[model samples]
Target chain A: LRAEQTRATIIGAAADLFDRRGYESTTLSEIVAHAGVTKGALYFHFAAKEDLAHAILEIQSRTSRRLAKDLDGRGYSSLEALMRLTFGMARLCVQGPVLRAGLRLATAPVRPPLPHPFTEWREIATSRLLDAVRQSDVHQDIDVDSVAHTLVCSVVGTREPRRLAEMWYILIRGMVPVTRRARYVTLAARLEQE
Target chain B: LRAEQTRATIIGAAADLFDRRGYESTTLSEIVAHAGVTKGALYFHFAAKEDLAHAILEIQSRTSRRLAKDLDGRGYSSLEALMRLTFGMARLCVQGPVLRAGLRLATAGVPVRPPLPHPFTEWREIATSRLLDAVRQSDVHQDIDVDSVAHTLVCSVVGTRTLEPAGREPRRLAEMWYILIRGMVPVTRRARYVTLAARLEQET
Candidate 1:
């Protein structure tokens, strides 16, 4: 438990620096300075700067799993749950250091020691979308995998919530047998007046 | 002529280092070594690293302008032009180090030097113009706020470019815009637009 506290101290410090200055811009000395820990203790907690980044990613993954579990139980429709998830994720990226720094490292061009949590999040999102389809919540012809990937990428790629809604609306309108594509057709036309 | 070559050398070297190691992380010495130029020569051209970054942003502008001109000449209609431009930008981000590096620098956590040019503003201007043209042509839905949508789309794609492997076909980008098209285009015409987007993805 004491060790875990020490570890969190290093990670919290690293996340702040990485979040503020990016992966490359933050130096070991700077981390030490802000962390108020001895270099030896910092070294003990993390192997390298990259290792610190990796830990942030790991922490972010746990956060994601926790979120997925929480979201899973809410019993909201899959699409509705996903919208909530997107909103939650944006807030997390902005407010949470683990996610903020983790997002920066994952998306930045620098090579990190740890793998990104994108694939795992994508997998979790894919399962949710597929479940939605299986339960007949989504249109029959909608390609769950592609839409799932799109949704995951959008959250990871961009921070906007409208894209979140638009993605769903688009898939709802887009992935249909043209003959029976009555849903969202009027809304689309309504959005686009003659 | 010699000065122009020297300028290109510095920008090219700096772009590579910035793209690979990031701007704030790269030092003058490393840039000198990669550039194969003396310290004196480096300072003679760029007084500071921020100056070099400014030059890179300028060069990126030229490349973007060149690309914009080339795409403008294509016979593609307004919507197709937007789609093609999106794919072409994906390819450009992969194939061109300057743009890739520029994209990285644009959003990196470093504080902006006020003297430096901002490439993202330029990108939004261009996208807004293209999107407005599409709206004017009735190829896109009428209700969309051209500028707002342009800024959002440009930001999102630019955000993704940093995450992708350089020089790989921008299949993710292709898939990305393909879906966005579904949301942007009207319902009655979505099928046709979707088909066009698929072909664009294939072309990319």
Candidate 2:
């Protein structure tokens, strides 16, 4: 348990630096001193800086799984659930170093053969949107793939998650029928306020 | 005149390399060999690879200014002018390495520095101002949030540039605009802009 504690401490410090100064710019020695852990402790936990990066990416993936699974178990409409999922992810981003660093590292061309996180996210959003289409919540004529691509891109690129509500407002206006629009639009604004 | 021509040639060759392989990964010798210029000639023109990057950025800025200025004087509606400006930029990117390399270098953190707003900032501001003009002209809905819309507009373009695998920006942009126009433009005038977007996408 003490060893585990030291591992978490090292990861936390590394994530902070990785988020602030890019992956290439950060050094493992800096990570060790920042964590206040001995060189021996860090080497025991992570063999290389790349291993630390992978650890951060895993934590991000784990968080994604928990949020996505918890929401999937809920009985909300697919569109609403996807909305909630993104807002939840946004909330996590605000209070944590892991997700922000994860996102930045994910975009860096580090030669990691690991699948790109954005591609995975786009797939998940696309699946939910397809469900929304089948449920008749979204207009059938609209192209699902394009919408999902742009939606993920917007969310990933946006600095403030709350402003995402405005984007949702625009998408809801365009994609939802008049009768269904009010609920989602109000829900989007409500989500932002939350 | 000869010196100026040699300088432009060097900038063009460097832009091609910088666009294909990033600024950091590309070397000056590769640029010289690619340009088929003597090392002395290349050295005469550029002090370093960073200077070549700055030259590409300057060309991009120059192109943007010319396009924007020319479109501004043409009396098109504000929204249409903005659309043309983006599409014009996209066309230039497809045809030349300068704009494409400039965009890549800009995002690569080459630090072009003061007296110039970052390209993304300029794009956002241009989008916001034009959308405001659109509202006044009654081409866009009055209640739409201009700032958010502009933010999304710039993000959509930049994101597409980053995320898309190839030079499919015009089609991707047209789709984004189609959705935005549907939501932001009044129904009475929406179809025209939608048609315009499709037309822009297909233009050669």
Candidate 3:
């Protein structure tokens, strides 16, 4: 337990520096200073700066997966679940430094392992949109792949819950049937406010 | 002038390094080596690496303004003009590395001059103006939301550069335009923009 705490503390410290300073500009000694861990302790946990970046990326992926799985079981409509999933992610980004740092690292020239976060983000969107279509919440004629791809792209490209809500408002108008559109738009607004 | 030529050479070399190796990891010595210019020459043009970054960004901004101005003079329909503008940018990205490097550095957290607007802000402003014009001209639906469309439009275009291969950007942008056109364009105007989008995608 103590070992795990030390690792968590080290990762948190590194994420702060990585988010504040560009990844390349951040140094291990600075992390030790911010983390209040000795050089020996820091070295015991992480061998290199890249390893710390990977660990943060891994935690980010796990956090996303956990949130998605939790929503998957709740039995909300696919569109509702998707909206909540994105808003939940935005909330996490607001409250924590790690996810923000993860996003920064994801874009940095620092290459992480394959199956990038963006790829997984698209997968989640595709699955939800597919289910929304089946659930009769979305138009069957619309291209699921294209819509999902664009949705994930816009959400990842921009940086706010309000912006996300606006994108969904446009999407709902386009993809949802005329009768069902108002409900989702209202839901999106509610999620944004909450 | 010989001075201008040397400056261009150094900026081109630095942009290549920044795009390939990233902004922070790139070194002035490497840029000097890549350009085959003396360290004195590199410093003569640019005092520091950040200065080189700002010059590329300024040139990229100027290029965008020039294209926008050229399209503005043609007097095409607002929607058509916007379509051409995005396609033209995608074409530039494919042909040159400066704009590509500029975009990479923009997100890489380099500081910019306070006076210069953020690239995304510029794109969003341009999109919003053209989309409002489209609505006025009845190319788009009267009830369509311009703000949402413009914001989403900029995001979609910006995202393509990072997500897809540089060459496929035209196709990717066309696909995005296809979706937005379906969403907001009137039935009478839909087929026109859709066909135009495809033709432009193929043009590049």
lDDT of 3 by residue, A1-194 (tens): 55578888888888999888878788876888998888888778777778887888888988988998998886799988987887887777766887778887877633445467877787888888889999999889887756445554343443356677776766777788999888988878875656
DockQ per model, Cα: 0.30, 0.47, 0.48
In the order shown, the candidates' Cα RMSDs to the true structure are: 5.4, 3.0, 2.7
Tens digit of per-residue lDDT, candidate 1, span A2-64: 556877777788889887777777888888889788898877767887777667777787688
Better of 1 and 2 by DockQ: 2
Q: Which of the two candidates, 1 or 3, achieves a greater TM-score against the reference?
A: 3
Candidates arranged by DockQ, highest first: 3, 2, 1
Point out where model 2 deviates above 4 Å.
A37-43, A110-113, A152-159, B27-34, B37-55, B108-112, B161-164
Which has the higher lDDT value, candidate number 1 or candidate number 3?
Answer: 3
Residue pairs of candidate 1 with colliding backbone atoms: none
Kindly list the per-residue Cα lDDT of model 3 for residues B1-204, writing each as its tens digit: 656776787677677788778888887788888887887887777667777877789888899998887667757768888888888778877777678787777776665555656777787787798788877777878876657667777667766345666667767788787777766777765788877888897553
Number of backbone collisions per candidate: 0, 0, 0
TM-score list, all predictions: 0.77, 0.87, 0.89
For residue A123, model 3's alpha carbon misses the true position, in angstroms, by: 2.1
How high is the DockQ of candidate 2?
Answer: 0.47
